[PDB]
């Protein structure tokens, strides 16, 4: 909106970097220098061109990160560099100590999660997506690495809303993958629901469908193949139904976010606080 980029202070004294957590720009474990409080800091290099988009990402985080299931926005800063050099944009958000769902998977033996854990997380992911979608915002990148956890087992979503490069196809929904049948492929709200389905399979079995397959072949298969089911029939039939609901190739036939939140796998959760404790106990 009407957001002034030049009014952004140099992060000096205000926020500092502690260490690196992941990449992409880079995401750092940062710190509010005075209070000492930790903070997740995303650092981007910035041209005069990207001034348009930056203005809108900042505006986005400012409006829709005020939700229980979305990582909260602290502020934005620019480290200005000599003329001709690119400046560095800092996005400072809430820091989620227990890291990502993906981390959570590598730390549990078997690399698989209790169904009740999967139920809780997905309910929380849906709630954040529900918030997003109501405000006309597509997440676009639902995966274990963009679903963060605090130390109180609070599920928080990150990196929402944001060339001739392609990327990781595994969490892509059939309508996103451009081909001959689907020439002008565009993201939809319901696309996030497909990604969620893949994310739930990622928690259940350890990896997305087509994981041990080359990214170019996986991109090829996702449209033509049937929707992925769970490889095991040892799961509850609610969970199976939930994967079937999320994972519908034809998105016009795919339930909306509101529909899915009412699904028995999501709606019926006793042992909720039992799960939140076992989660807390795991964060060590």
From Swiss-Prot:
Binding site for ATP: 21-27, 42
PTM comment text: Autophosphorylated. Autophosphorylation is activated by RAP2A and induces association to the cytoskeletal fraction.
Source species: Homo sapiens
UniProt superkingdom: Eukaryota
Residue intervals of the Protein kinase domain: 15-266
Family indicated by similarity: Belongs to the protein kinase superfamily. STE Ser/Thr protein kinase family. STE20 subfamily.
Function statement: Serine/threonine kinase that acts as an essential activator of the Wnt signaling pathway. Recruited to promoters of Wnt target genes and required to activate their expression. May act by phosphorylating TCF4/TCF7L2. Appears to act upstream of the JUN N-terminal pathway. May play a role in the response to environmental stress. Part of a signaling complex composed of NEDD4, RAP2A and TNIK which regulates neuronal dendrite extension and arborization during development. More generally, it may play a role in cytoskeletal rearrangements and regulate cell spreading.
Assembly and binders: Interacts (via the CNH domain) with RAP2A (GTP-bound form preferentially); the interaction is direct and required for the activation of TNIK by RAP2A. Interacts with NEDD4; recruits RAP2A to NEDD4. Interacts with TRAF2 and NCK. Interacts with TCF7L2/TCF4 and CTNNB1; the interaction is direct. Interacts with TANC1.
Shown chain mapped onto the complete sequence: 11 to 307 of 1360
Residues where Phosphothreonine is found: 164
Tissue-specific expression: Expressed ubiquitously. Highest levels observed in heart, brain and skeletal muscle. Expressed in normal colonic epithelia and colorectal cancer tissues.
Protein name (Swiss-Prot/TrEMBL): TRAF2 and NCK-interacting protein kinase
Stated consequence of mutating residue 42 to A: Kinase dead. Loss of autophosphorylation and loss of function in cytoskeleton regulation
Disease (UniProt): Intellectual developmental disorder, autosomal recessive 54: A disorder characterized by significantly below average general intellectual functioning associated with impairments in adaptive behavior and manifested during the developmental period. MRT54 patients manifest intellectual disability, delayed speech and hyperactivity.
Active site positions, chain numbering: 141
Amino acid composition bias (Basic and acidic residues), ranges on this chain: 265-284
